[PDB]
Amino acid sequence: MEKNVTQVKDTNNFPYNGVVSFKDATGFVIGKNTIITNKHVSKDYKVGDRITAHPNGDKGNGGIYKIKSISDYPGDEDISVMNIEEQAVERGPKGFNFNENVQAFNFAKDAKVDDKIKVIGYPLPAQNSFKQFESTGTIKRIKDNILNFDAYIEPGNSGSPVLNSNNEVIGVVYGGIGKIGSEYNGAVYFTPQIKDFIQKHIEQHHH
């Protein structure tokens, strides 16, 4: 029952500038024009729907962007990749370019139980007028593609990155119903098959 949650002061610096906001969920930047979220988020949103880059409430954001394509992982795991139209619908401080207004996360090489982790995202975004929050805790179990962690989350954290102490991404917070009665939370743990699927969807050039 770890509850160590802080309001993010400045979302314009990494890792905070790698996190994106849906109307009611979270995602994060993994590469050029590319974000990760979960399948619950990808069921709710469609091509042409919009994300906001790293909003800090009404203090501003890195722009508003259109979802260009959605690619759900073909395995059972709760993970989706979305590609983003590079030209913003509404500009960020660094201009209209998605990539200049965000910084992508790198994959962690691995993780182990008891590692210190951080979840960054948008809990209760209506109630907390889209402020970004960091929630800190530890890994409780890693089994195949299942990551159980002890860090406080709320509705809206669905799709949040789970980060190691060096701000590399280890997994993505579940959007599905959690284990009943459990004070711990779940995430898809990034294994080689999942990393490969993601990497194959990252963009590299302009058309």
- The residue count for binding Zn ion (CB under 5 A) is 1
Nearest approach, Cβ of residue 175 and Zn ion (Å): 7
Which one of 41-49, 110-118, 132-140, 183-191 is the stretch in contact with Zn ion (CB under 5 A)? Answer: 41-49
What is the bridge-based pairing of β-strands 26-31 and 5-7? unpaired
Q: Which of 44/154 has CB closer to Zn ion?
A: 44
CB 106 within 8 A of CB 168: yes
For residue 106, the 8-state DSSP code is: P
Question: Positive or negative CA dihedral for 132, 136, 140, 144?
Answer: positive
203 binds Zn ion (CB under 5 A): no
44 binds Zn ion (CB under 5 A): yes
Residues 6+ apart with CB under 8 A from 206: 86
Nearest approach, Cβ of residue 99 and Zn ion (Å): 5
In whole angstroms, how large is the CA radius of gyration of the chain? 15
For residue 58, the 8-state DSSP code is: G
Does residue 158 have an active-site annotation?
Answer: yes
Nearest approach, Cβ of residue 105 and Zn ion (Å): 18
Catalytic option among 21, 80, 135, 158: 158
Residues 6+ apart with CB under 8 A from 100: 92, 94
Does residue 54 have an active-site annotation?
Answer: no
Catalytic option among 24, 40, 44, 115: 40
Does residue 40 have an active-site annotation?
Answer: yes
Catalytic option among 78, 80, 160, 201: 78
Catalytic residues: 40, 78, 158
Residues that bind Zn ion (CB under 5 A): 44
